[PDB]
Amino acid sequence: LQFAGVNIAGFDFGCGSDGTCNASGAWPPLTQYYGADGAGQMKHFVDDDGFNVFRLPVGWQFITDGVAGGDIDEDNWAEYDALVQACLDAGASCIVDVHNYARFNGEIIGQGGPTNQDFAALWSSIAAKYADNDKIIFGVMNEPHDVPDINLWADSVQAAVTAIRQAGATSQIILLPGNNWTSAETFVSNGSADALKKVTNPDGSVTNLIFDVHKYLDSDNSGTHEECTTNNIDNAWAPLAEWLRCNGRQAFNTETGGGNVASCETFMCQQVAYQNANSDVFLGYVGWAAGNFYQGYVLGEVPTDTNGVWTDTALVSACLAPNA
Numbered sequence: 001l002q003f004a005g006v007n008i009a010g011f012d013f014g015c016g017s018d019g020t021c022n023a024s025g026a027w028p029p030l031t032q033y034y035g036a037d038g039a040g041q042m043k044h045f046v047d048d049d050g051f052n053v054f055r056l057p058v059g060w061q062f063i064t065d066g067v068a069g070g071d072i073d074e075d076n077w078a079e080y081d082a083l084v085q086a087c088l089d090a091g092a093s094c095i096v097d098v099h100n101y102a103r104f105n106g107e108i109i110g111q112g113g114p115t116n117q118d119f120a121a122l123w124s125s126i127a128a129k130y131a132d133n134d135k136i137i138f139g140v141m142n143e144p145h146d147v148p149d150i151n152l153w154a155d156s157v158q159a160a161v162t163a164i165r166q167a168g169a170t171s172q173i174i175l176l177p178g179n180n181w182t183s184a185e186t187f188v189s190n191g192s193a194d195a196l197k198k199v200t201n202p203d204g205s206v207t208n209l210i211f212d213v214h215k216y217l218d219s220d221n222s223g224t225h226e227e228c229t230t231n232n233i234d235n236a237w238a239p240l241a242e243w244l245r246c247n248g249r250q251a252f253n254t255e256t257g258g259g260n261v262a263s264c265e266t267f268m269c270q271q272v273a274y275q276n277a278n279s280d281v282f283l284g285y286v287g288w289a290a291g292n293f294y295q296g297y298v299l300g301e302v303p304t305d306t307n308g309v310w311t312d313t314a315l316v317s318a319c320l321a322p323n324a
């Protein structure tokens with residue numbers, strides 16, 4: 001109810017689930033840079049649909065041109081900032097999502113891979129850009145999975161948070177991701193919640209530290225199927241809210257979606273109706289996948305521009321748009 005948005009993808013392309021980002025394969029979803037009209041996409045999603053925030057996936061490698069640290073490469077950053085500027089210019093809040101699966105080329109941050117410091121550095125720099133700007137929302141890490149020790153991971157996340165506040169980003173939300181691809185279904189049961197509950201700002205508060213969760217509507221939670229089989233209320237959003245409420249904490253669903261078909265319009269509308277009903281514990285949903293996915297993409301949300309007139313995919317206009 002506070003936020004509803006869509007992921008504008010492209011800078012994440014050739015990012016693998018193992019933290020390897022073929023930083024050649026990055027493809028900015030902006031007219032210029034020879035990609036789709038991501039800016040226009042966002043004008044439309046706000047002005048006509050009532051969307052509010054956009055999530056802008058990008059890889060560590062792109063930000064730094066291949067290095068695990070925080071030395072931001074200016075030419076690449078110029079590209080990525082233009083998208084963030086388009087998101088802000090559209091009137092919305094923007095999640096800056098480092099799309100690395102808690103890894104850097106095969107190896108896990110804090111646990112085999114780059115150190116918590118290598119990582120913290122990164123976020124200091126990102127935060128230093130953008131510190132004053134309160135419409136930014138820092139997404140620490142996208143979809144950690146098969147991590148062996150969650151408390152060490154929560155330590156890595158502490159390190160980022162602390163980096164972020166110390167660069168002056170005092171007013172922003174920071175999203176905190178846990179294990180199993182931050183599945184919302186296992187977020188409490190696997191220890192992600194209790195570990196991440198310990199993460200605090202420098203002054204000792206949890207103000208503006210929101211859990212980051214993801215949930216798809218297909219049998220295997222992959223978001224690779226067109227057809228949908230559930231609304232995740234019974235097994236995910238209900239238990240989650242109970243837990244979230246009694247602990248005085250909030251979560252944010254930064255990835256979800258489904259195919260542009262009947263079964264999904266019924267089941268997604270159910271999930272979104274429930275999520276609004278629990279607006280105290282859930283800050284919002286963000287739908288996975290506009291930007292520069294081709295039309296036949298199974299989870300597609302890219303609208304169409306006909307001489308100024310935009311047209312949404314089925315699922316956005318039937319279910320995901322606040323204006324419906």
Ligand SMILES: OC[C@H]1O[C@@H](O[C@H]2[C@H](O)[C@@H](O)[C@H](O)O[C@@H]2CO)[C@H](O)[C@@H](O)[C@@H]1O
Nearest residue numbers: 017143180181183214216220221222223
């Ligand atoms: O679900 C989000 C994320 O999932 C990836 O697939 C996982 C899935 O999360 C898990 O439930 C299933 O059992 O295994 C697969 C991997 O084997 C998927 O690769 C991503 O595209 C997606 O963003």
